[PDB]
Amino acid sequence: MAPRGFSCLLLLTXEIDLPVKRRA
């Protein structure tokens, strides 16, 4: 898991929209 930051800011841009949609 990321330090709830680098990947946290990318979640807003939609970059990391995989762990917030479906099981995938």
End-to-end CA distance of the chain: 16
Whether residue 17 contacts residue 11, with contact meaning beta carbons closer than 8 Å, is answered with: yes
Task: Write down the experimental method used for this entry.
Answer: NMR
Whether residue 11 contacts residue 20, with contact meaning beta carbons closer than 8 Å, is answered with: yes
Residues in the chain: 24
Q: Tell me the C-alpha distance between 22 and 3, whole Å.
A: 22
* Two tokens, residue 6: 């680098």
Structure-token match 């949609």, residue found: 21
Distance of CA 5 to the CA centre of its chain: 9
